[PDB]
Design an enzyme around this catalytic site. Structure first.
Site, mmCIF file in Angstrom:
data_model
loop_
_atom_site.group_PDB
_atom_site.id
_atom_site.type_symbol
_atom_site.label_atom_id
_atom_site.label_comp_id
_atom_site.label_asym_id
_atom_site.label_seq_id
_atom_site.Cartn_x
_atom_site.Cartn_y
_atom_site.Cartn_z
ATOM 1 N N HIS A 31 0.802 -1.217 0.000
ATOM 2 C CA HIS A 31 0.000 0.000 0.000
ATOM 3 C C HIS A 31 0.840 1.274 0.000
ATOM 4 C CE1 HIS A 31 -3.406 2.616 1.251
ATOM 5 N NE2 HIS A 31 -4.118 1.688 0.641
ATOM 6 N N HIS B 218 -8.782 10.494 -0.494
ATOM 7 C CA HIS B 218 -7.983 9.290 -0.508
ATOM 8 C C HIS B 218 -6.666 9.500 0.227
ATOM 9 C CE1 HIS B 218 -5.516 6.016 -2.337
ATOM 10 N NE2 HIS B 218 -6.657 5.355 -2.256
HETATM 11 O O1 LIG Z 1 -6.087 3.465 0.540
HETATM 12 C C1 LIG Z 1 -7.149 2.876 0.273
HETATM 13 O O2 LIG Z 1 -8.307 3.376 0.372
HETATM 14 C C2 LIG Z 1 -7.044 1.411 -0.225
HETATM 15 C C3 LIG Z 1 -7.797 0.425 0.415
HETATM 16 C C4 LIG Z 1 -7.753 -0.917 0.029
HETATM 17 C C5 LIG Z 1 -6.928 -1.295 -1.026
HETATM 18 N N1 LIG Z 1 -6.863 -2.667 -1.431
HETATM 19 C C6 LIG Z 1 -7.913 -3.541 -1.385
HETATM 20 C C7 LIG Z 1 -9.067 -3.730 -2.175
HETATM 21 C C8 LIG Z 1 -9.524 -2.993 -3.376
HETATM 22 C C9 LIG Z 1 -9.704 -3.645 -4.604
HETATM 23 C C10 LIG Z 1 -10.130 -2.946 -5.734
HETATM 24 C C11 LIG Z 1 -10.383 -1.581 -5.671
HETATM 25 C C12 LIG Z 1 -10.203 -0.918 -4.461
HETATM 26 C C13 LIG Z 1 -9.780 -1.612 -3.327
HETATM 27 N N2 LIG Z 1 -9.846 -4.806 -1.684
HETATM 28 C C14 LIG Z 1 -9.177 -5.282 -0.587
HETATM 29 C C15 LIG Z 1 -9.460 -6.354 0.335
HETATM 30 C C16 LIG Z 1 -8.596 -6.607 1.357
HETATM 31 C C17 LIG Z 1 -7.411 -5.827 1.536
HETATM 32 C C18 LIG Z 1 -7.112 -4.805 0.685
HETATM 33 N N3 LIG Z 1 -7.987 -4.532 -0.372
HETATM 34 C C19 LIG Z 1 -6.156 -0.314 -1.675
HETATM 35 C C20 LIG Z 1 -6.208 1.023 -1.287
HETATM 36 C C21 LIG Z 1 -5.330 2.086 -2.023
HETATM 37 O O3 LIG Z 1 -5.918 3.053 -2.549
HETATM 38 O O4 LIG Z 1 -4.104 1.904 -2.038
#
Ligand SMILES: O=C(O)c1ccc(Nc2c(-c3ccccc3)nc3ccccn23)cc1C(=O)O
EC number: 3.1.4.-
Length: 438
Positions: A102, A327
């Site tokens: 992330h 975000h």
């Molecule tokens: O910062 C944020 O809001 C953020 C939050 C979650 C993330 N990853 C993610 C997603 C997903 C998939 C597709 C489209 C959006 C999110 N689904 C899951 C499930 C479990 C763990 C992580 N997951 C990425 C981000 C980012 O923007 O880096």
């Protein structure tokens, strides 16, 4: 200004609200340096779009994409990049279940030096279009003359800490970037690095990462003031993890306790959590599609309704961004009247145990699932006792910190609900005339 904290450009607001903002094309422009090589750490990538953001003269310089994708997702990313022979990829190891890569960071190697960019945006068009996102821009770091022996280190230990963060990947492509950083002078850096890497950390390593890293920095480099118990904690994020059946399990036991640390000696501290309501999303510039980037599932939310009594609306009149959904993730420690802050953190870390770490083994081990990265602004690193809050984000002393949203935060109304992305909203249409049908 000494802080070099920027917001991304938002399409549709008046020009006065983009005057001090940055688009990705600005960051990569030749005005910031003559690009030799770059590394793009991120979660999501649109490679075709990403390459178009580099200036045409720089589009064939080597690019490394650092990601966490596996299996078919990894194949899709490699397929995206294969048309570009100059793009290499580094798959960050994620050996603990449910972790993600992330961290959002650019390493930009120039003919003139090196720059580090730590930010909050995915490398896709929508993350830079109508969202509130944060950017920290490092100084131009000069190269250390060959034959000269100096540390190139800052009073905040940023160079060693950034190398330590990259070493955790155990990756050959990143050892190359470690050697690049070693050759540059980072001594002008005035921010502290706060990273998360996956692992189980005990003993001498417990303070290296996550919320224990934050606690260690606040113990060592902030001072506790009288009436400290009345200085609230504010957290502001775009995603919420499973925090447990009540606030005692994690939020108000180890997370809040790290956040309220100040100084070296040994809780009714108010805790404000800022997270978009359904109404915030509906009336946003993007409309309901903005909620595609606010991933709070109904399955998680229904097990922690206690949490939503901490939630406050998104409001950002100070930066003209109330309708630009956040975000960015930020954490800070304002004074009881919100006129000063004891510290400010911008980061990729959402409100989750995966990102910040959760104690294990009778409190002796901190387990972190994900990679995260942020930078901490401490008044002591600027010769100050506290920061005064800038009243208008894009307005003119330069020792006042640009908080990008309104203070004090406004509690959800009785009819408000947290944005939950995988349930329908069919009662009122968004700014584009549509409902939300997951
Ligand atoms: O910062 C944020 O809001 C953020 C939050 C979650 C993330 N990853 C993610 C997603 C997903 C998939 C597709 C489209 C959006 C999110 N689904 C899951 C499930 C479990 C763990 C992580 N997951 C990425 C981000 C980012 O923007 O880096």
């Amino acid at each position: 200004n000494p802080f070099q904290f920027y917001l991304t450009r938002v399409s549709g607001v008046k020009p006065k609200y983009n005057s001090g903002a940055l688009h990705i094309k600005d960051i990569l422009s030749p005005l910031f340096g003559t690009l030799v090589s770059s590394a793009q750490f991120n979660y999501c990538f649109d490679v075709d779009w990403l390459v178009k953001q580099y200036p045409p003269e720089f589009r064939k310089k080597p690019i490394l994409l650092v990601h966490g994708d596996k299996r078919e997702a990894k194949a899709h990313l490699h397929a995206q990049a294969k048309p570009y022979e100059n793009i290499s990829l580094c798959q960050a190891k994620l050996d603990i279940a449910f972790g993600t890569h992330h961290t959002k960071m650019m390493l930009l190697l120039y003919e003139e030096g090196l720059r580090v960019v730590i930010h909050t945006s995915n490398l896709i068009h929508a993350d830079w279009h109508q969202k509130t996102q944060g950017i920290w821009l490092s100084p131009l770091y000069p190269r250390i003359a060959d034959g000269t022996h100096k540390s190139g280190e800052s009073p905040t230990h940023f160079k060693a800490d950034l190398i330590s963060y990259l070493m955790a990947y155990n990756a050959p492509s990143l050892k190359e970037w470690i050697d690049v950083i070693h050759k540059h002078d980072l001594s002008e850096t005035n921010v502290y690095l706060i990273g998360s890497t996956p692992g189980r950390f005990q003993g001498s390593q417990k303070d290296n990462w996550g919320h224990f890293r934050l606690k260690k920095l606040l113990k060592d480099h902030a001072s506790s003031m009288p009436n400290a118990e009345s200085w609230p904690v504010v957290g502001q994020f775009s995603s919420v993890g499973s925090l447990g059946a009540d606030e005692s399990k994690w939020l108000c036991s180890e997370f809040k306790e790290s956040m309220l640390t100040l100084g070296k000696e040994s809780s009714s501290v108010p805790l404000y959590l800022i997270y978009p309501s359904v109404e915030n999303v509906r009336t946003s510039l993007e409309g309901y599609p903005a909620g595609g980037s606010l991933p709070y599932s109904i399955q998680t939310a229904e097990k922690q309704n206690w949490l939503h009594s901490y939630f406050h609306k998104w409001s950002a009149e100070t930066s003209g961004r109330s309708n630009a959904m956040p975000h960015i993730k930020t954490y800070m420690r304002p004074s009881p009247d919100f006129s000063k802050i004891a510290w400010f953190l911008v980061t990729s870390a959402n409100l989750s145990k995966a990102a910040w770490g959760a104690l294990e083994k009778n409190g002796t081990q901190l387990m972190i699932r994900s990679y995260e990265l942020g930078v901490l602004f401490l008044p002591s690193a600027f010769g100050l006792d506290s920061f005064k809050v800038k009243q208008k984000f894009f307005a003119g002393p330069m020792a006042t910190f640009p908080v990008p949203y309104d203070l004090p935060p406004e509690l959800y109304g009785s009819k408000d609900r947290p944005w939950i992305w995988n349930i329908p909203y069919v009662k009122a249409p968004d700014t584009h005339g549509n409902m939300w049908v997951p």
